Amino acid sequence: DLDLAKASATDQLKKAKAEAQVIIEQANKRRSQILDEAKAEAEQERTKIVAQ
């Protein structure tokens, strides 16, 4: 029984590592997806002011 408890513990830590990677991955994907939209909108703003 003891060993089943040990295995559950190591499995919890494995799941924690997987979720850490997944959440930081999504956070970096969000960095890029936010910055690209900001880049395109600022650049179209430039184009508008220049045309003015």
Binding site: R46, T47, I49, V50
Partner: protein, 52 residues
């Protein structure tokens, strides 16, 4: 964007100055050919020979 606005200001200023410059000399030419005579020819030739 501000940089290009300023550069286009400069470029249009130059574009206009060019036309003014060429037309000034074309007008001067036509005026001269319309206004020279024996007196002006004699004056020019005498003034250059006086320093030849």
């Amino acid at each position: 964007a501000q940089a290009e606005i300023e550069a286009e200001r400069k470029r249009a200023r130059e574009e206009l100055r060019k036309q003014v410059a060429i037309l000034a000399v074309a007008g001067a030419e036509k005026i001269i050919e319309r206004s020279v005579d024996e007196a002006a020819n004699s004056d020019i030739v005498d003034k250059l020979v006086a320093e030849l």
